[PDB]
């Protein structure tokens, strides 16, 4: 009969597109703002405000995250040919997440939210599997081109200090054309990636695996393997052993077979491409992309960006657009806010904010575990063809049910 | 009065698989099939002795006789170079052979009703066609020791202007860099092989790439497939009510996880290498898989046992200790090659024998006679007792008796 909200501090918010934008606003309206006062720095990364500002709004939000150390980002449209038409864009703008990653740096850690009544697709997975994706280099910064006919492709290195160049033959095309590409990574980026992985394994108490293909790329993938091993021996091995965990290198194909027959419960450090791909595989194996969280941990050990690990759910948004009922899972988006607020509360020693962030995570899981859930989770239980309308809640019924349970939980603890 | 078997190129391998290989031939093959065997030793010592020329000679012999069957082989790491005092950390024979022959490697689980799958919805099989040529498996990678410029250059053979592209200006330290390529003609054969596999199985075909990122490199795989599809295969796909689609690799691994199986999955060399191990494990046992390289000439094939050489079991066999080594992938390398041998020769007896041996293998396991690894797939290893499985020679022996019965019953 006379309450006062939690003062949450400074957070950078990146508004997004299509179905995740709708969810994003329901989360703020029903779960966050009634309990938490925020110093929000909002940036509209919607497809048409980006285009409006020649994508300057993306870069500015990236700089804002550097300044305030905490960002929460909604899924955004990444333009392709179709999208330039649909929004009559000025150009095919770069992915906002590549731009944001490239400015911030670091490792992207992805993890499924587990509810005990939600069957996995992979039978053995009891505990979670946290993939740490090295968010820099390799294919994502590579230079590729078409080879139009017979000829020589070479890759050369010219030292900056003046000494003589070295020239590696890629291929003599003798029979026609094809394609070629060069790609690189940097030692300091690999070192930051190793440290974040060892640190993540130690804070979760779980073992750590790095996957490469160094049997084939002895120099390129060998560099990753060597940097991890030296940093582990010099800096982490005795800590790992003190907690009865361990670090091992694995070939990527051995690693995906090992992961598939494990029980989970390990950190999986992936090079850029493998982490991009394998984390969608892992996400689906747990049940639903809607349940996949993601946090960019920057090398300063202080800045994070939290987001859902899925897209804008265009398919559902099209149905929403023509008045048709939808059942879109908000948990990944919710945990973007709770992870961002948890981190804000850690930097600030804000006890009430940290208790709120965890209460909302608990509430989300408890609601599903009591049998109230969106359709994608119902399908995990029954199999899609066998789901009845009575087995699940639509988008708005589920937020309402969550909002109801969160008011109860928070008024209980006071 | 044996079955006429014809010419077959055999590549001998290493450690436990080398041992099982000899047992397969003496127990299951040679008692029923007379063969003109052309045998190349790809054991790690002989590759070292010949500076790996024997691997090149084997691949050439496959061009000549059209059928190869390859035993698993050691791919040396640094511990192996010490063990054998190798002249260099030789590269996998599979890479050299695939580079010489070109083609597509089709991988598919070997399914036993009593071996549980780990992925719940995979009720039908998933066939991966891995492009066998180029990309990371023919690349050149090096260490960048400090600041400097990495560039990549194309010099046309006809003497016109060369083109140079900045890969990276290293300004803050060193790192690594690599160059890699593929060929139009080899991609086309990749496409043809995939469209033909789909049509022959009556299943739909998906090609995965990452063309959102590698717009030129992966875009070429995409454009080649689409062009060949529209001009040469779309009509026949529609007549069988199947289709072809390009999918982004990320989308596709998720789609496959939640799918029911029953499709052809065309993969670039790297993805096919990685996802075929994921898929074999998902169907229940990483080792229960077929791996058959189908060459562009449409006539030549090389079946291989895809797993490792089982070093721990070999050491135990060296010390004269009981082992329980699964032979099924080596057996199916023999049956797949002989089956294709029988196809080129219109040899109905050889074709019958190859499928019999495959059938005996499945039936024997489904009846409850299996090696320790398979019993552990069923009970869980901590719960496996000695009486739940056969040792290496007992299993081979049960296979041999069941095969002898199947061939007699059939006449
Ligand atoms: N972070 C972002 O800003 C991203 C935005 N995009 C965009 O999103 C739109 C559509 O893309 P899409 O392919 O449709 O993916 P998405 O995940 O939205 O939906 C797929 C299907 O997954 C099921 N599903 C997903 N979520 C839910 C849910 N909550 N509830 C229930 N079912 C769900 C549902 O399944 P169904 O119910 O249909 O069976 C759905 O349809 C495109 O514009 C992309 O640019 C993709 C990912 C990242 C970035 C992009 C980048 O940086 O370039 C990325 O990671 C990458 O690099 O690729
Ligand atoms: N390929 C090459 O193969 C060699 C070793 O590769 P590695 O990665 O060590 O994999 P291995 O082939 O050595 O097998 C690894 C382990 O998995 C199990 N295993 C593998 N194949 C079988 C089988 N056919 N029957 C039963 N159990 C099996 C065994 O587990 P256990 O020992 O627990 O029975 C074995 O110890 C290397 O030189 C590599 O280059
Ligand atoms: O890659 C090798 O060295 C051969 C073993 C292997 O991984 C395979 O054949 O798939
Ligand atoms: Ca991805
Ligand atoms: Ca492999």
Author numbering:
A (entry chain A): 0 to 413
B (entry chain B): 3 to 413
Study authors write:
IDH1 is a highly conserved, homodimeric enzyme that reversibly converts isocitrate (ICT) to α-ketoglutarate (αKG) through NADP+-dependent oxidative decarboxylation. Tumor-driving IDH1 mutants catalyze a NADPH-dependent conversion of αKG to the oncometabolite D-2-hydroxyglutarate (D2HG), while typically ablating the conventional reaction. D2HG competitively inhibits αKG-dependent enzymes like TET2 and JmjC lysine demethylases, causing DNA and histone hypermethylation and cellular de-differentiation. We identified one mutant, R132Q, that maintained weak conventional catalytic activity, drove robust D2HG production, and was resistant to mutant IDH1 inhibitors via a mechanism not yet understood.
Here, we report two αKG-containing R132Q quaternary structures (R132Q:NADP(H):αKG:Ca2+). These co-crystallization experiments led to a variety of complexes, with monomer asymmetry observed. Overall, we were able to capture snapshots of stable conformations of αKG binding ranging from semi-closed (αKG-bound) to essentially fully closed (NADP-αKG adduct-bound). In alignments of R132Q:NADP(H):αKG:Ca2+ with quaternary WT and R132H structures, the catalytic residue Y139 in R132Q was shifted away from the αKG molecule, with this molecule making fewer hydrogen bond contacts within the R132Q active site compared to R132H. In R132Q, the αKG binding site was shifted upwards towards NADP(H) and away from the substrate binding sites seen in the ICT-bound WT and αKG-bound R132H structures. Since the αKG-containing R132Q structures did not appear in a catalytically-ready form, it is possible that the enzymatic mechanism may rely on different amino acids used in the conventional reaction, or, since αKG serves as a substrate and product for R132Q, we may have a view into a product-bound conformation. However, R132Q behaved more like R132H when binding the neomorphic substrate, with αKG-bound monomers showing residue R314 swung away from the α9’ helix, precluding the necessary polar contacts. Interestingly, the closed R132Q:NADP-αKG:Ca2+/R132Q:NADP(H):Ca2+ dimer had an intact seatbelt over the NADP-αKG adduct, suggesting that a fully closed conformation of αKG-bound R132Q is possible if the nicotinamide ring of NADP(H) is stabilized in some way, such as via adduct formation. Despite the shifting of the αKG binding site, we noticed a similar compensatory mechanism in our αKG-bound R132Q structure, with a water molecule again recapitulating these polar interactions.
